[PDB]
Amino acid sequence: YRARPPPRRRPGPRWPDPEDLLTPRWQLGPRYAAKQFARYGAASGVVPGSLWPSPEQLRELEAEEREWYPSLATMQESLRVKQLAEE
Amino acid sequence: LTYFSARKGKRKTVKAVIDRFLRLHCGLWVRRKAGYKKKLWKKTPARKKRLREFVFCNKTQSKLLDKMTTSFWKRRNWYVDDPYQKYHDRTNLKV
Amino acid sequence: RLQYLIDLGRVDPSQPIDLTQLVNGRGVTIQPLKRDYGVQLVEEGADTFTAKVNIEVQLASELAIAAIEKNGGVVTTAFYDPRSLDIVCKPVPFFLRGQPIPKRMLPPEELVPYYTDAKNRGYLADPAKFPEARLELARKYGYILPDITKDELFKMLCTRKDPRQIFFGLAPGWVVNMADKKILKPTDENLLKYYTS
Amino acid sequence: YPRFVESVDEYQFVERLLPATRIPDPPKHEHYPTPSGWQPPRDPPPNLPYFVRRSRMHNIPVYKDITHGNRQMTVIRKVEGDIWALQKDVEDFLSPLLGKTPVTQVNEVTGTLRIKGYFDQELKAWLLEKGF
Amino acid sequence: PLHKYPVWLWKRLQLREGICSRLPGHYLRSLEEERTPTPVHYRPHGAKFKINPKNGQRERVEDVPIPIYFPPESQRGLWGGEGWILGQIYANNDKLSKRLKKVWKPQLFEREFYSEILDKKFTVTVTMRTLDLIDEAYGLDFYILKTPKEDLCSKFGMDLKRGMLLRLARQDPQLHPEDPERRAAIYDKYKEFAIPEEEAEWVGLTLEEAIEKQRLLEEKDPVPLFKIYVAELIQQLQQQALS
Amino acid sequence: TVIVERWWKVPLAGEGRKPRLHRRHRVYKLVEDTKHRPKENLELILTQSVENVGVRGDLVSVKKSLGRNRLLPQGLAVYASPENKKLFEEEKLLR
Amino acid sequence: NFEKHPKELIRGPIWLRGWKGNELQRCIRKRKMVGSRMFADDLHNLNKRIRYLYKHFNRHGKFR
RNA sequence: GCUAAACCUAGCCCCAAACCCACUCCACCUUACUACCAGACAACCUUAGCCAAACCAUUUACCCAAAUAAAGUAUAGGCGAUA
RNA sequence: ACCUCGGAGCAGAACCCAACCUCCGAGCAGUACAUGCUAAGACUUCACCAGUCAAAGCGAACCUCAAUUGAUCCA
Ligand SMILES: [Mg+2]
Ligand SMILES: [Mg+2]
Ligand SMILES: [Mg+2]
Structure with a gap:
């Protein structure tokens, strides 16, 4: 008997139907398309410009990083201040 | 005690031994002697320091603590300037 | 172990040694999920050591620094955060995501003096003081200071990455692709301003 | 959408970053024993009833083993050929050290020896001067 | 055995399939x-x-x-x-x-x-x-x-809200008899909240009365087979006279 | 509108997934009732002059009780909002 | 050339395609993955089962 | 030798895949399956408890939206069981 | 009536040994203020908890009694 054909990964991206509920939302998410781009090259048809953050996303990111992660100047300033206090 | 979890189906540690004891990768356990901060005025100083000092544990309660704790607390850790690296590993032992 | 790896020939000392090459040679496995900020050098193996390598590291003991400087190598520390260390120690899984090269960040409130001291060979420390520290270490451990300025590969030895840059070739904001191999920059003013900030 | 620009010239760094998948044949050091006490196998190999192969990392297949916390032994893993000659040879080699003949355990199926006590460094030097 | 879909999807699948399927998209978006x-x-x-x-x-x-x-x-x-x-x-x-x-x-x-x-x-x-x-x-x-x-x-x-948006969209004199000035002043003050008449009608309604109004809209006596056949026959006879 | 907060800490959840609840979280404590809080007089512009308050075109802060009671239902005053305060100030300038 | 793994080849239920475990772990995985699609009475029986199995494995038996 | 004995089918369980049901001859909410008359009658409420803690009194997992992993970690907790 | 600790006998001579067996007691007190820090090696109230002795060294001068008492969390 000829053996059944060898099972193989589906060639090409996997673009599900968004108007289909049982399909999870993490496929419709953009990170999915980014993964498919990085995997199957530009053949996916995904626009490259979409993966970068929008200006709003960049704004929130710079805001949170400026708020939480300080800079070297302020860092060394606080170091000097606390060292002087200890002294 | 909780040999199988409800959400993941895994063992679960009691944080009691985590707060009270310490494990060394050799398989040993240390502990702060009890009553080391209570009623120090009546106790003689030799007793005070016998209470202050660390000590080890029996093999029985050692393996009991091991049984209730999980492998995360039995793993090798490389801390910075942690004084117990001198003692995690054993030297010049037989039998 | 470093001598073992180099004389087995898995890591090329002619090429600048760094954490990526170490992890590819399997000299050290890393578990950033277990909050291991990197790799440290230790005093063991000072003898029988002829590396000459330009090792990149996070921690460094004075014995290892002195031995490498005696054999003519180069030692300098480089703080990586957990996520940066993850991208470094497993680059391909990150490139399968398609999101751009992240940016390193400065050390936390504690390790800035450490990575800024010159005796430490911190990448943030001044270069003007590195000769001084090399001189004190030589004067300490009784070995002449070999001027590596003469050899042909002083350029290789002084190849270094500035902070907020993961790889010697790549920079943050860059996007890499291997299927239909390409590299992509934004060339947008705001984006590049951020990725340089 | 944001703009972008493409390049291919900077792919050499990525090619460098790509990891390896086979152990490389070590380089030819002009003088041996190279540091770390490594010594490649002699060529041609020795004509003997048996032969010991190296590991993936081109090391000798001696190892140690501990069991019950006290049983303290060393094993030879991948002896090819007549392992009985080899076990007799190591017995004759180690008899003067202990004053007694070991009672080693041979598994000629896998080609393994199992000897009480640690003799890893001694057996390594022995197999090196034999040229395996 | 098992269902094809989960239970918490049944209600939205029903929203997509049935009388409510004929509803406009903006109302469904608002309720969801x-x-x-x-x-x-x-x-x-x-x-x-x-x-x-x-x-x-x-x-x-x-x-x-x-x-x-x-x-x-x-x-x-x-x-x-x-x-x-x-x-x-x-x-x-x-x-x-x-x-x-x-x-x-x-x-x-x-x-x-x-x-x-x-x-x-x-x-x-x-x-x-x-x-x-x-x-x-x-x-x-x-x-x-x-x-x-x-x-x-x-x-x-x-x-x-429904009535107010409807009135703003209609711009009716029903509100201010003899005061077009006040009418226009108020409508200009509240001009920006205005939305289409159909939107003002649909807004402010649960799915029950939504489907009820949809039924009241769709419902109508069926045109007789006799009438449609008379139409088709007149068409056929016109075609025959043409040919 | 009483304000409350949970005695127990809720297990943190994802941004896309809603948290698990339990009566351990149903239990509450009272933090503030925001009715014992001292009132804040609201600003309003009165058209018709009245005793001790002000005159036409004038703005003033007054009690919520009185304002909600007699000013607004009578149609005398209006809210101090940018739809009309510019009209008030420009008619004042005209005067 | 390592295009696929032998675990995704087996034909079977969805809560076990390349996985092994005792009955407790199996039932909790089944509710975690399929409990939404499950019938009401079957889900109730499964909850009772995980409850009984928790009680048994954690409270009952030797070795404690 | 009787009483008896033997049978192998009906069908059933778990999965997978796929979403699913409604005489439209008469009758059925009054005392259902009953041909025919003046009422103003309408739903929206925390689950608790056993058990465990060797008593019990705070507490004791029971899903609600990607499988694995981080992780049984950070945390909570008569800082106990346990979560 | 008792519930913890110590001493004596039963238990005469290395250790241990119970009884709602026979007797006496304790739940402190007193003197210094190096009643400081460290540390080999050992005993151990039949387990664990606890409880004991202590060479040497640094630093210093020139404890008695028998029990005389209470873990963890917490404040
Ligand atoms: Mg073994
Ligand atoms: Mg004892
Ligand atoms: Mg002395």
């Missing part, structure tokens, strides 16, 4: 928005990340709303963004004591208010928070129009 309400019964954390005082380390935080109870009279009469809080508490604010089944219900007030668009004086059970927020909105109708639906949580308020 599921937008978070304004917090009234707890202080929301100003930031998503927060540093606890125990250890000097970051800790993500996410506010959690309270399961408020909305009685029927609350929907009948505009209360605001509040309702009965059903829960339980420890006695003497001591964890290590007796737990007790507790119920909080706000202080209601029966007050009169007037609106220039509806031109009618209504009586409703309202609250201090309602009064304060309408004062912040600088008038009742402003709040009734600018209310995110989940914050208003009152079908009476939603019906007021």
Whole structure:
């Protein structure tokens, strides 16, 4: 008997139907398309410009990083201040 | 005690031994002697320091603590300037 | 172990040694999920050591620094955060995501003096003081200071990455692709301003 | 959408970053024993009833083993050929050290020896001067 | 055995398949928005990340709303963004004591208010928070129009919104006889809240009365086979006379 | 509108997934009732002059009670909002 | 050339495609993955089962 | 030798895949399956408790939206069981 | 009536040994203020908890009694 054909990964991206509920939302998410781009090259048809953050996303990111992660100047300033206090 | 979890189906540690004891990768356990901060005025100083000092544990309660704790607390850790690296590993032992 | 790896020939000392090459040679496995900020050098193996390598590291003991400087190598520390260390120690899984090269960040409130001291060979420390520290270490451990300025590969030895840059070739904001191999920059003013900030 | 620009010239760094998948044949050091006490196998190999192969990392297949916390032994893993000659040879080699003949355990199926006590460094030097 | 779809998808699959399938898209989008309400019964954390005082380390935080109870009279009469809080508490604010089944219900007030668009004086059970927020909105109708639906949580308020938007879209003289000046002034003041007539009609309705209105729209006596066949036959005879 | 907060800490959840609840979280404590809080007089512009308050075109802060009672229903005053305060100030300038 | 793994080849239920475990772990995985699609009475029986199995494995038996 | 004995089918369980049901001859909410008359009658409420803690009184997982992993970690907790 | 600790006998001579067996007691007190820090090696109230002795060294001068008492969390 000829053996059944060898099972193989589906060639090409996997673009599900968004108007289909049982399909999870993490496929419709953009990170999915980014993964498919990085995997199957530009053949996916995904626009490259979409993966970068929008200006709003960049704004929130710079805001949170400026708020939480300080800079070297302020860092060394606080170091000097606390060292002087200890002294 | 909780040999199988409800959400993941895994063992679960009691944080009691985590707060009270310490494990060394050799398989040993240390502990702060009890009553080391209570009623120090009546106790003689030799007793005070016998209470202050660390000590080890029996093999029985050692393996009991091991049984209730999980492998995360039995793993090798490389801390910075942690004084117990001198003692995690054993030297010049037989039998 | 470093001598073992180099004389087995898995890591090329002619090429600048760094954490990526170490992890590819399997000299050290890393578990950033277990909050291991990197790799440290230790005093063991000072003898029988002829590396000459330009090792990149996070921690460094004075014995290892002195031995490498005696054999003519180069030692300098480089703080990586957990996520940066993850991208470094497993680059391909990150490139399968398609999101751009992240940016390193400065050390936390504690390790800035450490990575800024010159005796430490911190990448943030001044270069003007590195000769001084090399001189004190030589004067300490009784070995002449070999001027590596003469050899042909002083350029290789002084190849270094500035902070907020993961790889010697790549920079943050860059996007890499291997299927239909390409590299992509934004060339947008705001984006590049951020990725340089 | 944001703009972008493409390049291919900077792919050499990525090619460098790509990891390896086979152990490389070590380089030819002009003088041996190279540091770390490594010594490649002699060529041609020795004509003997048996032969010991190296590991993936081109090391000798001696190892140690501990069991019950006290049983303290060393094993030879991948002896090819007549392992009985080899076990007799190591017995004759180690008899003067202990004053007694070991009672080693041979598994000629896998080609393994199992000897009480640690003799890893001694057996390594022995197999090196034999040229395996 | 198992179902093809989960249970919590059955209701939306029904929304997509049936009488409601003929409904427009904007109404479905509005009812499926599921937008978070304004917090009234707890202080929301100003930031998503927060540093606890125990250890000097970051800790993500996410506010959690309270399961408020909305009685029927609350929907009948505009209360605001509040309702009965059903829960339980420890006695003497001591964890290590007796737990007790507790119920909080706000202080209601029966007050009169007037609106220039509806031109009618209504009586409703309202609250201090309602009064304060309408004062912040600088008038009742402003709040009734600018209310995110989940914050208003009152079908009476939603019906007021429906009627008001409908009147703004129609620009009817029904409101101000003999005062076109006042009419136009008010419509210009509230010009920006305006939306299409069909949108104003559909807004402020649950799916039940939505499908009811859809049925009242679609329903009509069937045209007789006799009539359609007369039409087809006249067409055929015209074609034959042409040929 | 009483304000409350949970005695127990809720297990943190994802941004896309809603949290698990339990009566351990149903339990509450009272933090503030925001009715004992001291009132804040609201600003309003009165058209018709009245005793001790002000005159036409004038703005003033007054009690919520009185304002909600007699000013607004009578149609005398209006909200101090940018829709009309510019009209008030420009007619004042005209005067 | 390592295009696929032998675990995704087996034909079977969805809560076990390349997985092994005792009955407790199996039932909790089944509810975690399929409980939404499950019938009401079957889900109730499964909850009762995980409850009984928790009680048994954690409270009952030797070796404690 | 009787009483008896033997049978192998009906069908059933778990999965997978796929979403699913309604005489439209008469009758059926009054006392259902009953041909025919003046009412103003309408739903929206925390689950608790056993058990465990070797008593019990705070507490004791029971889903609600990607499988694995981080992780049984950070945390909570008569800082106990346990979560 | 008792519930913990110590001494004596039963238990005569290395250790241990119970009884609602026979007797006496304790739940402190007093003197210094190096009643400081460290540390080999050992005993151990039949387990664990606890409880004991202590060479040497640094630093210093030139404890008695028999029990004389209470873990963890927590404040
Ligand atoms: Mg082994
Ligand atoms: Mg003993
Ligand atoms: Mg002495």
